[PDB]
Every structure is written in C-alpha cells, then in structure tokens.
Design a protein around this ligand. Structure first.
Ligand code: MG
Ligand code: MG
Ligand code: MG
Ligand code: MG
Ligand code: NA
Ligand code: NA
Lengths: 384, 384
C-alpha cells in the first residue's frame, strides 16, 4: 500500500517578482513586489511526494476539502486516468468552483509524484519523443511603457534582442484593453511589420492579438499578416464562437491556430477539428485540465495529421512537448525588454527550461516534472 | 547509459496447441500439434529485458536486421514515441516488409521493458483507469464440426455454456469461406437468433460476420439483427470501402463498430470518425502497430465522445483496456466448445487475463505486460 495517497497539502508562499496583471488579466512589468503563490503536494504511504504550482484561489480550502481530497486520499496515485475522470465528473455539480485549472494542478502533481517515485522524468515515463525542442520567444502584451512595448518600433527592437539570444521564432502579443487606445488593427499590423523588417525572412513570426476582435477586424488583421509571411494568427476573435473561426479560417490563407482559452478540454477541441475551425490545433496543461488531457489533445490532433501547439511555459508544458511529435515549439515567455527571463523564479534553484544559444530548450534530466524546487525558500516565505 | 538498448533478440520455439487456421486465416480447433511461435526480447546495458510474442515471419531476420535493430540498438528504450515514429517513417520504403505487426511487437516489447525495469504494470505506467473489466466471450468463426459450431443451434448451446462461466457479453463470429456453403446471411441471422433465445434479453450480444459481404447483404444482415437487440455489427463489409460503411451506418439503427482490419493506424481511424463511417470506433494493438498508437486511437475516440472497442485478447490489449475509460469490454477468446480457454498457453505459467465467475477479467499485478513467461519451456522447445 506504499502507493496509496495519504496527504494532499497546499502551501501558500510569497514570491518576489516584477510581474503584474492589469484589470483584464494581461501581464506587464512593474515594481518589484511580493505575490502569493501556491504549491500543491501529494504524498503517499511510503513518504514519496509530487508537487505542482498554481495561483492560491485554484487550490483554496473550499476546493481542496470539497473535491480534491475526496477523490485522491486513500487511492493508488498511479490511477491518474481514474482520478482525473473522477474530478471531471464532479465539475458539473460544483457550482462553478471545480475548474479546469484545479484539475490541471492536481494532475500535474500526480505526474510529478509518479516520476519522482520512479526516478524518471515525466516525458520519459510517457514515452519520449525529443530531449530538446526549439522555443519561440513569446512577447508580453503591449503596454504604454516608454522603451517597453509602447510602439511598433519597440517590438522591432525587442525582436532584435530575441534573435541575438538565439530564438528562431517570435510571437507578438499586441495591445489590448486597458491600454488606453487599444485595440487597433492598424497598430497591431505596424508592430508585425516592424518585427518582420527587424528580423528578416527566416525567423518565424506569429501573432496573438486582442482576443475578441469582430469578424471584420480579424479578417483585416489576417489579410495584413499574409503580406508579412507570418506563420499563424492566434485567437483574434472570441473563441466561444466556433462558427466565427470556421468563417475566418475559410477566408484567410494564413493558418489559424486554436482554440487556446475555450473550455471543454479535448472533447471541445475535437469539435474545432470536425468543423474546420482552425488549421493548427491548440492545447495547454492549464487550458484542458492537466498533462493527461493535454496528451489526449496532442493525439487527437496527430490522428488528423495536424499540429497542436502547446500553450504556456513551465515544466508541465515542456514535458508534453517533449513527449510528442506534432508540435513545432515550446512556448518560452512571457518576455519583455525590462525583464531577463533566465533569472527564473526565486522558489526554483534552476530553470525548468534552459535554452541554448541556438534556440533549443533542453529538458532537464530530473525526475518528475523536474522542477528544482527550493523547499527552504518556500518554508521561509510561508503565508499559510 | 543503463537505459540504452544493447540487444534485440528473437527466439522461435514450438507451442503445443489445438488451434489451426484455414486457408483464409480463420482459426478452428483441430488435432493437437506443434506450431512455431516467436518471442522478441529487447535488452538494455543494465541487463533489464522486455519481451513480446508474435508469429515468426513478423520478426524474421530480414525485418530484424534491416529495420528493427537499426532503429533500436544504441537508443534510450524510454523514447518509445521517437522509436515508433522512426519505424513508421521506414514503412513506406520497406518494399511492404515492415508491417504494422512488426511495429506492434517492437512497441510492446519496449513497453514490457520499461515496466519490468520499473517494477510497474504497463497500465499503471500509462495511468490506470480500472484494475478489472467485463469481458465478452469471443466465439471462433463457424465450422462444419459436429457439435462444434456447425449449426445455429450449436452457437446457442455454446452461448449457454459461456453464460454459466460468467460472461455478460458474447460475440459470434459466424460462417466464412472455406466453410463449404458460406457465407449466407440467413444462416448468420439464425445463429444470432438461436443465441438470443438461449441467453435471454440481458446478456449483451455482438456479431462479427463474413468480412466482405456486399452492401445489400450487409444491410439485410443488420436489419435482421435489430429485431434481436444486438449491441453491434462488426466488419460486415470490406473495410477498404469507407464509403460503404458510411452508407451502412446511415441505413442501420444498430451500431456499426470499426474499422478493425483497415490499415493506416490512428490517422485512418480519424477518417472513419470524420466521415461518420461507424458508430463505435475499433482499434487493436496488432491492428494499429502497438500499444502506443492504440492509446492514441482511444484518445481520438474519447475526444469525439465515442467508444473504441479494443480488438484482441492477451496482455497487450488488456493493458490498453485497463488504461482507458471509453471501452466497454476486453475481448476474451477466441472460444470454442471443444477447447478450454483457461488452460492457457504452455509457454506461460499463468493466465494474463484470468476471469472471475461474474465475468470480470482482473489485470495481474505483475510488472510490464505481466506475461508470466516460462523461459525454461521456451529454451527446451527452441527451433531457432
Ligand atoms: Mg495565446
Ligand atoms: Mg485558411
Ligand atoms: Mg473482428
Ligand atoms: Mg446507424
Ligand atoms: Na489573441
Ligand atoms: Na466481420
């Protein structure tokens, strides 16, 4: 019974960061400050542990006591599919509180536990495809910070810095409310043009614009991007409208990648394929409720001969990318000229996603998700 | 480098069996005789091994030397996805010799190797869903053996025996060439009716008839089955005709399950979903080239809210069934009144798929595929 789960624990601690979020949830660089971060730990009878990180609300006591502990405690930790399905079945009746984000952090901690228990990196446990992968530099949403990302030229200058670092692909997130004047298609296209001019024709370029443009605006944006040879347009319209995406994909030559934020996990993503609503599928550990359903999405896409680009940085996403073939990139970011991404997090002793000078991220040969957790730091900076 | 593959070995040995195959490849009971069986073994630097069984031609020296050793020797055995994709890429140029059956046994041996190395059952390594599952009793193709499966009544009598054993589902394979008079739709329906009459309304019934009936014959067969409340009709037409299956499914109320034998792995099975060619998907370790692509097919199906019924007995298929939710049964057979399935194989010390008196097969808690191999027997009965 050494494999039986005995504890589900949450530790909230302060991390020091310059990352802030605006009222709509977009990240920007700001003053250094302390932000509450949560670590979920699952422990088995033999004392083995697995861990994963998320925002405190996602693993708050209401959710832990009412849902997570009831499913997990006393169960064989290796039954990840049964445990995931148990949580999935409880979402409908959860009064909107058992979210995909909660499923995701639980699933990740269980994968980390299995990997740590076996001394195996998660992607090797899944069945490895690649030990390294090209990353694209994923640039923060636009701002109104002088010399930051305030002008099209600012994007161009930052792109030059990213190319020098070794990135072979770059994705712009352009300007969104509450940026005072945003959004504006012509401005977004000017940023895209400045980047293409700055980096030349052989660096791959992508854009993730304001996520709720009208059909007419997204059409204008996409048509403008085709002149610049961009690789994809990402979430330019409200993803709750599958029909809008079929229409836009049919009208644009440039590949449309999606859905990123839409709910419904792998099930709903099958509908995007069935309806021809995108040319490249999207998934993400946080978007579909864990590594387990993210793998399902990757396989779904591959069966249709499609790529499925994995949304988000950090180990959990990197291991999905490393275990699968049909994905061009790991998403490395968000990035901003005021910040050095390689500084990492104060609660991790080393990067989960180090990138060489040629633009390849190498998956750390460390057990589980391979997050090099500074447990002492976390204990010294505990909130609750 | 303990995880690096050092050897790929094939041992051909004689198994004593009463199973014979007719000219079309359908199994029937016959005289006890010795049949050549092959075991593929993959070994790593640390001496750990994984094994899987197949027919000798599938792992003959041509295939092993030209394809398998070149991909595997010197590689990290845990990179199952990379190694599978490497073999898949070589199939096109293999002059038709590198078959899905060869990919399957290799993938299975690699899974067994990982599981044995880690002391973990394969389904637990994948991420467990269930430790037991209902089995249906899968009856051999019809014959002309008196008291065997020669008449509709013979199927009825055998079905009574299967129900007493504990099976909660039964699948008939009916009469096929070279049975002298076969095939005949009315005879197949009479067997189906005899079984329904024998077992009553609460045992689930399925039929896998002659695999190449015309559209008109398959339609008559399916319409006849609806009167008997059968759960599915399986491969009644040439599966190379996807369009015939769309037509048949649209015409029948009874669920059509497929494709079983069609090539193209998970890629082609996506086409069966896209075209609405079946109501229930089918996969199988031997049919799609391994546990790895079988899992992909299961996930593909689940994303569409469909079931995917796993073709074939033995550990390799049982572990797929145990790791996934969207499958009603493990297929236990082929079965015949002249044979006791629970006798098992002379080269295995115990059953990989023991079934209780309530009809549940319990996955053995043994590492890897959990095949209880009698290595001594194999050594004593070696051919080459
Ligand atoms: Mg995005
Ligand atoms: Mg298009
Ligand atoms: Mg069949
Ligand atoms: Mg129908
Ligand atoms: Na967007
Ligand atoms: Na058939």
């Amino acid at each position: 019974s050494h494999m039986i789960i005995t504890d589900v624990e949450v530790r909230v601690f302060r991390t020091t960061t310059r990352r802030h979020s605006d009222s709509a949830g977009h990240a920007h660089p700001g003053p250094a400050h302390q932000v509450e971060q949560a670590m979920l730990t699952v422990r088995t009878e033999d004392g083995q542990e697995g861990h994963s990180f998320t925002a405190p609300e996602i693993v708050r006591p209401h959710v832990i006591e009412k849902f997570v502990k009831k499913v997990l405690i006393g169960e064989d930790h290796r039954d990840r599919e049964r445990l995931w399905q148990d949580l999935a079945h409880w979402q409908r009746g959860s009064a909107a509180q058992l979210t995909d984000r909660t499923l995701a952090v639980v699933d990740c901690a269980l994968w980390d536990l299995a990997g740590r228990s076996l001394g195996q990196p998660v992607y090797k446990l899944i069945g490895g495809y690649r030990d390294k992968v090209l990353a694209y530099g994923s640039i923060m949403c636009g701002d109104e910070l002088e010399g930051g990302l305030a002008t099209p030229e600012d994007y161009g200058r930052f792109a030059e810095t990213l190319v020098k670092r070794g990135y072979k692909g770059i994705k712009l997130h352009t300007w969104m409310p509450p940026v005072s004047w945003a959004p504006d298609v012509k401005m977004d296209l000017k940023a895209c043009a400045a980047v293409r001019e700055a980096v030349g024709p052989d660096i791959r370029l992508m854009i993730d614009a304001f996520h709720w443009y009208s059909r007419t605006d997204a059409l204008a944006l996409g048509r403008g991007l085709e002149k610049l040879g961009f690789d994809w347009i990402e979430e330019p319209m409200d993803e709750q409208s599958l029909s809008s995406y079929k229409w836009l994909s049919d009208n644009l030559d440039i590949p449309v990648v999606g859905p990123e934020s839409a709910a419904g996990k792998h099930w709903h993503r099958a509908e995007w394929i069935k309806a021809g609503a995108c040319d490249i599928l999207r998934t993400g550990v946080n978007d579909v409720g864990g590594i387990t359903p993210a793998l399902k999405t990757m396989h779904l896409a591959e069966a249709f001969g499609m790529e499925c680009e994995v949304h988000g940085n950090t180990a959990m996403n990197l291991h999905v990318v490393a275990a699968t073939k049909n994905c061009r990139w790991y998403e490395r970011g968000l990035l901003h000229p005021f910040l050095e991404y390689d500084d990492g997090h104060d609660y991790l002793k080393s990067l989960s996603d180090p990138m060489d000078r040629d633009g390849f991220v190498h998956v750390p040969d460390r057990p589980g998700l391979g997050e090099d957790i500074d447990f002492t730091f976390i204990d010294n900076n505990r909130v609750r």
